[PDB]
C-alpha cells in the first residue's frame, strides 16, 4: 500500500498478542452439541416470543424448551461479541498507529530535504570577513608597490583557509546525515512504543459472573432436573432465563462501553503525547543542525582573525603558519570538536604531518 | 544550596566552554602601554567634551590628544562589554536550566511517591473473582455434606493461587523501581541536552570591522603621522574618531541586541520543547506502571478461570494442578512476560521443579 513503515516497525504493528482475551471459552460453558446448535427459524421465533408480555401455562414444555435454547444462543452470541470487541480494538489501534506513522514520516522527509538544503550551501563566512576588513590590517607605510605584494600574500593565506571551509562542508554533511538517521530511528521507536502502550493498558471488565451463571442453569435444567418434562412453573423458568440473558447483555454493554469510552480516553492521551514528542523530534533535529553550523561559523571567525593578525604581525611566516594551522586543526573538525583560536595558534607552531613524511 | 541535580549533571551545568568568544583581543589591537591606560579625571572630561557641539581650532593638540585617547577608551570599553555580554549569557543559561532541573525533580518525586502508593497495594483480584462466582461452579448434585468438602478443596486452590499474587507484587515493585530509575535518568538527559543546546546555538554578530578600524587609526596617528603635533585639521580628526566610537557602539548594541532579542527567542523555543518532553516523561512513566498492572490483572483472571474450571471438571486433581501451574509459570512472571491460560494449562501437566529435586 502507501505504508512507509520500516521492516521491524510493520512487524510490531502486525502482531496482535498484547491485547489478551481472558473470557470463559464455550467448551468450559456448553456441551459440544450445544455449541453446534444453529437453531431453526421456528426455534428462534419461539425464543424471541418469551420476551412478549404473556401469561404462561403452569406446564408449557414448548416455552420451557425455548428458555433453555435462549441461554445457549445468549452464550454463543456473547462469546462472538467478545471476540469481535477485541478484534475491533486491535483493528482500531493499527489504523490509528499506521496513520500516525505515515503522517510522521511525511513531515520527516520535509525536514530531511530542508536540512540538506542548508547543508549543501557552501561556507563563505571566512572569505566575507577578510574581504570586508582587510584594509584595516595593511601596514602603515602603504608604499605604492608594497601593498600589492601584501595582497598577494594575503590571497595565499585565504586560499589555504578555504580548505578549512571545504573540510567544514564535509563534516556538516556527515553530521546532517547522522542527524537524519537519529530522527527516523526516533520516530520508529515512538511508533513502536505507542502501539504496544495502547495494547498494554487494555483492561476490560471480566464477564465471569454472567457467563458462569448462564452455563449453570443449563447444567441444572438439562439433565439433572429435566425441568421441561416435569411439572414446574413455566413462568419461573422464563423469568429465570430472561434475567440471565439480560445479565449477559449488561456485561457485554459494560465491556463494549469500556472499549468505547474509558479505554478510548487512554489511547487518546497516549496518542496525544505520542504526537507531541514527534513534533519535538522535528524541532530537536533542526536545532542540532543549527548548533553544528554554529560550530563551523566559530571556526571561520577564529581562522579569519588568525589570518588577519598573522598577516599584519608576521607577513613573512603567514602563509606557512596558515597552512600548518588548518592541517593540524582539521582533525578537530572531523572529530566534532570546536576550533578555538588558541588551538589555531598552538597548531601553527608545529609542522604538518604531510610535510613531515613528504606526502605532499 | 537547594540543588537536586546529580553529580554529572551539575558538571555539565558548571562548564562554560560551549559559548565561545571570537572577538579580537586587546593585544591584537592596542599596545601594552595603551592597554594600561587608566586616564585621569581631566583626561576623561576632555574626551567627553569632543561630543559637545563646538568649532575647533585648525591646530588644537589638546583636543587631538583626547581624540586618540577616546579610541583607546572606546576599544577597552568594547572588550569589557563583550566579555560581560558572554558572561551574562552563560549566567542566564545556568539560572534557566538549574531552575527547570529543580522544578522537574520536584514533580518527579511527586510521581515517584504516587507510583509506590499503588504498587504497595496488594493484589486481591483473584480472590474477589472466585468469591463472587464460586457458586456457579459447584456440582449439580449439591449433597448436604458433599459441598463442604468441595469448598475446602477450593480453598486449597485459592491459597495456592494467592502465592501468584505474592509473586506479582514482587514483580510490580521491581518494575516500578526500574520505571522510576528510567524517569530520573531521562530527566537528567533532558537537562543536559537543554543546557548544551542553548550554548550551541549562540552565534552573535562579529565585531571585526569595528575593532580593526579603530586600532588602525590609532596605529596611523600615534607614531607614523604624529597628527597631534603636525598642523592637521582638528575637526577632521575629531570627526574621524567620533564616527569610530559610534561604529563601536553600533556593533556592541547589535551584539547585545542579538543576545537579548534573537538568541533569547531560540532559548525559549528550546526551553519550551524541553519543558514539553519532561511532561511526557511523567505521563510515560505513569502509563508504563499502568501497563504493568494490567499484565498482572491478566494473570489473575486466567488463574481464576483456570482454578474454577479445574475445580468443577477435575476436583480431585485441582489442588495439584493449581500448584504445578503457579510454580511453572511464575518464571514467566519475573521475566516480565504475560501469563496466558494456555500457558497455565500446559504448565499444570508437568511437575514442579521443587517436587522433582525434593526441595519441598
Residue numbers in the entry:
A (entry chain R), B (entry chain R): 33 to 392
Text taken from the publication that reported this structure:
To ensure the success of lytic replication, the herpesvirus human cytomegalovirus (HCMV) expresses the immediate-early protein IE1, which acts as an antagonist of antiviral, subnuclear structures termed PML nuclear bodies (PML-NBs). IE1 interacts directly with PML, the key protein of PML-NBs, through its core domain and disrupts the dot-like multiprotein complexes thereby abrogating the antiviral effects. Structural characterization of IE1 has shown that it comprises a folded core domain (IE1CORE), which mediates the interaction with PML and is flanked by a short disordered region at the N-terminus and a longer disordered region at the C-terminus containing a SUMOylation motif and a STAT interaction site. All three IE1CORE proteins display a femur-like structure consisting of α-helices only.
Of the two ratIE1 variants, only the N-terminally truncated variant yielded protein crystals. This variant, covering residues 30 to 392, is from here-on referred to as the ratIE1CORE domain. For crystallization, surface lysine residues of ratIE1 30–392 were chemically methylated. The structure of ratIE1CORE was solved to 3.4 Å resolution with Rwork = 21.5% and Rfree = 24.6%. Initial phases were obtained with the MAD technique since any molecular replacement calculations with the previously determined rhesIE1CORE structure failed. The main chain of ratIE1CORE could be built from residues 33 to 392, and only three N-terminal residues could not be located in the electron density. In case of ratIE1CORE, the correct sequence registration has been corroborated by two additional anomalous scattering experiments, thereby rendering the possibility of registration errors highly unlikely. Thus, helix H1 is significantly shorter in ratIE1CORE, and the position of H2 is rotated by approximately 90° in comparison to humIE1CORE and rhesIE1CORE. Furthermore, a kink separates helices H5 and H6 in humIE1CORE and rhesIE1CORE, whereas ratIE1CORE contains one continuous helix termed H5/6. At the same time, ratIE1CORE has an additional helix H12 at the C-terminus in comparison to humIE1CORE and rhesIE1CORE, which consist of eleven helices in total. However, whereas the stalk and the adjacent C-terminal head region of ratIE1CORE are formed by continuous right-handed coiled-coils, this segment is interrupted by a region of left-handed coiled-coils in rhesIE1CORE and humIE1CORE.
